[PDB]
Design a protein around this ligand. Structure first.
Ligand SMILES: Nc1nc2c([nH]c(=O)n2[C@H]2C[C@H](O)[C@@H](COP(=O)(O)OP(=O)(O)OP(=O)(O)O)O2)c(=O)[nH]1
Ligand SMILES: [Mg+2]
Length: 292
């Protein structure tokens, strides 16, 4: 009864001079935003990136989440999550669903879009900056129980499910154009982004200030380190622990007056922090890749 989809406001810098992509589908003779249904096991961001490529022929990097829409379809209810997405390459070619694509300034695109829920999404897009950089704060994957581990608990490794979460995070974090890697000084934090390190061929920088013990004793040192990592070129992944993340996220959202639409703290979850000129403009919580 409820069909789950994901899509994007794909934009390009025409010089940044923002134009957004609007696609035409012969089946309905309509103009809309690229989007499609989630495949089995696929997360919303991974589906959004795939649909951009399938419907527009562009590669893109997702940025800020633009909320969700719900509308009735003959089958019941369509529910779609949307992202801002910056084109990074490729080109349009016609496909089974799409015969035309136009690139328009936002005011012209608003007039071209015929569905109310697409115009609501485009309004969300123009409300805040879209040429953003992204900090990806990841809680390490499942690693069994402290109680049932003999050895230094710092060496406690991911369990099978956690190793699978770590593999599933590669497509999720590459959808946001991850480029640099940071982990708290715990094996289970490093192992979570080990698969991404191999995909990027990139080293993980160890972070002694971002462990639970270090955070609990010196919040301020951890906040300063987060802002320093965030200031460096690239889109950093920071993998840390359950008693660290809520504190850091809540502190930054209060300071920037940013209200997260979703929240949680599960093992394997990701916070997508969107920055524009050093200011937080979005804080998007993504469930673990193996959970709804
Ligand atoms: N794309 C889109 N279609 C909408 C919106 N509002 C609305 O009533 N519709 C209509 C168009 C169709 O009559 C119907 C189903 O269209 P759809 O695009 O959601 O579904 P679909 O299965 O054809 O396509 P897709 O999810 O595979 O991309 O819903 C909207 O905001 N966007
Ligand atoms: Mg589609």
């Amino acid at each position: 009864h409820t069909v789950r989809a994901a899509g994007a406001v794909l934009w390009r810098d025409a010089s940044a001079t923002v134009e957004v992509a609007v696609i035409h589908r012969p089946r309905y003779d309509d103009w809309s935003l690229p989007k499609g249904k989630l495949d089995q096991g696929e997360t919303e961001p991974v589906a959004a990136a795939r649909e951009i490529h399938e419907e527009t022929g562009h590669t893109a990097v997702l940025g800020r989440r633009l909320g969700r829409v719900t509308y009735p379809i003959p089958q019941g209810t369509k529910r779609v999550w949307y992202w801002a997405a910056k084109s990074t390459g490729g080109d349009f070619s016609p496909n089974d669903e799409v015969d035309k694509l136009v690139w328009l300034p936002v005011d012209a695109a608003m007039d071209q879009l015929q569905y109310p829920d697409d115009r609501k999404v485009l309004r969300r897009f123009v409300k805040r900056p879209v040429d953003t950089k992204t900090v990806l704060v990841v809680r390490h994957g499942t690693a069994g129980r402290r109680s049932r581990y003999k050895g230094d608990d710092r060496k406690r490794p991911l369990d099978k499910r956690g190793r699978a979460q770590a593999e599933a995070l590669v497509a999720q974090l590459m959808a946001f154009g991850a480029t640099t890697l940071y982990a708290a000084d715990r094996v289970r934090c490093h192992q979570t982004i080990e698969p991404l390190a191999q995909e990027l061929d990139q080293l993980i920088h160890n972070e002694p200030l971002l462990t639970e013990e270090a955070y609990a004793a010196d919040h301020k040192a951890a906040r300063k380190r987060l802002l320093e990592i965030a200031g460096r070129p690239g889109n950093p992944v920071i993998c840390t622990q359950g008693k660290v993340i809520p504190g850091l996220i809540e502190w930054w959202c209060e300071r920037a007056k940013v209200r997260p639409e979703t929240t949680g703290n599960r093992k394997g979850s990701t916070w997508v922090l969107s920055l524009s000129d050093g200011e937080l403009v979005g804080a998007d919580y993504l469930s673990p890749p193996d959970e709804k």
